[PDB]
Design a protein around this ligand. Structure first.
Ligand SMILES: CNCCN(C)Cc1c[nH]nc1-c1ccc(O[C@H]2C[C@H](OCCC3CCOCC3)C2)cc1
Ligand SMILES: CNCCN(C)Cc1c[nH]nc1-c1ccc(O[C@H]2C[C@H](OCCC3CCOCC3)C2)cc1
Ligand SMILES: Nc1ncnc2c1ncn2[C@@H]1O[C@H](CSCC[C@H](N)C(=O)O)[C@@H](O)[C@H]1O
Ligand SMILES: Nc1ncnc2c1ncn2[C@@H]1O[C@H](CSCC[C@H](N)C(=O)O)[C@@H](O)[C@H]1O
Ligand SMILES: [Mg+2]
Lengths: 351, 337
């Protein structure tokens, strides 16, 4: 009976074990870590966000959830933490242990292999640090691992770095996309063959799909005031279950001027608590702000729509785990542009 | 599984991006345009087969050069777009688009000329050349024209400066973030060099460590070339280094040559690092780790390009090489996904 109930869960439990393992394997190679650490905005935001809380970290214990090469854990030790548990489920944990030793910090930072969900710490911790954010914030679905660790291991009143997240959406015009669509009408001048009749085909291929595209934009690509559509306070009880139901909200905005609208961009920021005198540090992935390796996540309409000053853009957006793969971000979008009817598009993160 | 591998191949060419990339490649596309134009005397009033016509652009170049009839054969769903482009340019009487593999297409007649852009990364990735030769044997009239007419492969030892910057990245972490990660160079090396994938990457002339060596010549008019592709294309090479450098491996690349026509001006389309960039870039064969070379360090070996056993359209490279008085070494590569 007890045994029968356990046997019934065995297949789903195993399948998840196996999907988790393939997810962690994405972090076994050097390139993703090179990219993360070359991202100075990301990495310095963590460095400074940690340093700013030095008075609260001095002599205290820290859990680094998903420590990777160990860099954030070493920041915490440099801020005066007495002990840091650097938990890492990917094989990169070996490189983290080497980095820790190479910096003479093997007494301060202990690298523990395996998922944070099952790791055994000697004690509860005074603080948790984690870089858990995926494309569109929630791709990878790592946030639930951080919350799991918090619930199990963070002391009452303990510190979370960062502490909260916000999501934003705006209508956009993608200049690179615009050039790719217009390419076919330029072939005649380059080569003497008129291929302008392929613009429709190009549009279907490049906009008619349902993949979320990771692409970096600039401020001038934004066609209306960005709208916050979600706020995640990481200490909030039951946030774990909300993630499974969907994160999102409704939006409305009004366009700045004339432009070919290609869709929407979403992006996020996270906030580190300020420390004693110090001010709250915001790590932003906005097109208005210095570029990061997250870029923005683009949600293309089926085809362009021309907008004008004060064209109204509204809708609803929800971020979900995808059906076949929980670690793949899915976006359900409802939107209405100007006097067009309301439309629906269901996206999944590109491979 | 054979039905299914072709389908995934032609799906690639069903989508716009590959054709945009090919046509935005000005060196590629103008080389064909000029190469075709140059042979107007062989083409005027004649019939042409375009093997793998794609969006139809080369077939239209042929009609513009005065061909009376062009059979644009295309196995992917892009054949629909080619037929639309042909109609849109008023050439439906001159260019006929025929769907399906050239191996089984039925033409109404033999042709005076074949044009084809059949070249993959490292020349032979995709394994399209056998389709062109199949068409030539079956459909090209005796003495007919082939555009391009020949191909050549080249190899040179290289020091990839961009790779070197990636390997050296870890030693620069301390300066900006105050954490010493120079101990990860070994790891970075194993990840970036220790794999057995062929990497498509553009190099500078400055990255070439010795005189490039031709290691194969493909004369497309030769009966028997079909079977050689099956045995492997390649042979030995030897060269001597220009100066001091951390050698990372070898680059291979190719050129193709269009006959000169009346004007007797052969046009070479090159993918060399010494020439303007093309979408083929070069194909890189990295050693497991760097080896230091000096002026006059001798580099020799043998290379063979083959289809992969499990996927005939995937390029495989068997390399044997000897640097200086190092022991001879071996590495097998397959084209990256
Ligand atoms: C939490 N900090 C993330 C910060 N950066 C996004 C990391 C990064 C830099 N470059 N590239 C990546 C990256 C890393 C992982 C990644 O996502 C993986 C989720 C997908 O597998 C899940 C597959 C498993 C196994 C098969 O079954 C389904 C689940 C790809 C995407 C980009
Ligand atoms: C004959 N003239 C080719 C000229 N260019 C190389 C075309 C091109 C421009 N951009 N990108 C390509 C490209 C096209 C095809 C390609 O490789 C082909 C083999 C690939 O899947 C076959 C089977 C798939 C992938 C491997 O695993 C199994 C499924 C498509 C690579 C680059
Ligand atoms: N449940 C889990 N337990 C342990 N590690 C995890 C995990 N989920 C994800 N990870 C790891 O968390 C890391 C996220 S990327 C961040 C790496 C590092 N903290 C840095 O800032 O550079 C990856 O190495 C990934 O393998
Ligand atoms: N056996 C075969 N028969 C017909 N078409 C083929 C083929 N093998 C490949 N192809 C097609 O050959 C084309 C090669 S790419 C070159 C496309 C076009 N001629 C241009 O120069 O822009 C692709 O569109 C591909 O689908
Ligand atoms: Mg550098």
């Amino acid at each position: 009976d007890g045994a029968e109930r356990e046997a019934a869960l065995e297949r789903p439990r195993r399948t998840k074990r196996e999907r988790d393992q393939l997810y962690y394997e994405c972090y076994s190679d050097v390139s993703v870590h090179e990219e993360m650490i070359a991202d100075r905005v990301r990495t310095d935001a963590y460095r400074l966000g940690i340093l700013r809380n030095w008075a609260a970290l001095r002599g205290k214990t820290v859990l680094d959830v998903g420590a990777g090469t160990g860099i954030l854990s070493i920041f915490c030790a440099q801020a005066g933490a007495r002990r840091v548990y650097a938990v890492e489920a990917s094989a990169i944990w070996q490189q983290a242990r080497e980095v820790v030793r190479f910096n003479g910090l093997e007494d301060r930072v202990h690298v523990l292999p395996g998922p944070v969900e099952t790791v055994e710490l000697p004690e509860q911790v005074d603080a948790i640090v984690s870089e858990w954010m995926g494309y569109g914030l929630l791709h990878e679905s790592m946030l639930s691992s951080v919350l799991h660790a918090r619930t199990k291991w963070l002391k009452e009143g303990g510190l979370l770095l960062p502490a909260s997240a916000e999501l934003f959406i705006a209508p956009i015009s993608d200049q690179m996309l615009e050039w790719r669509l217009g390419f076919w009408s330029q072939v005649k001048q380059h080569y003497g063959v008129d291929m302008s009749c392929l613009e429709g085909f190009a549009t279907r291929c490049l906009m008619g799909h349902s993949e979320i595209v990771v692409q970096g934009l600039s401020g001038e690509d934004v066609l209306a005031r960005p709208q916050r559509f979600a706020q995640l306070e990481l200490s909030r009880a039951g946030l774990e279950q909300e993630l499974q139901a969907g994160v999102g909200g409704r939006f409305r905005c009004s366009c700045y001027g004339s432009a070919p609208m290609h869709g929407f961009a979403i992006w996020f920021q996270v906030t580190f608590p300020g420390g004693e005198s110090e001010k709250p540090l915001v790590l932003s992935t906005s097109p208005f702000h210095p570029a990061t390796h997250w870029k923005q996540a683009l949600l293309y309409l089926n085809e362009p729509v021309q907008v004008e000053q004060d064209t109204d853009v509204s809708g609803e957006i929800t971020l979900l785990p995808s059906r076949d793969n929980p670690r793949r971000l899915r976006v359900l979008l409802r939107y209405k542009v100007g006097d067009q009817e309301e439309k629906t598009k269901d996206f999944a993160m590109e491979d």
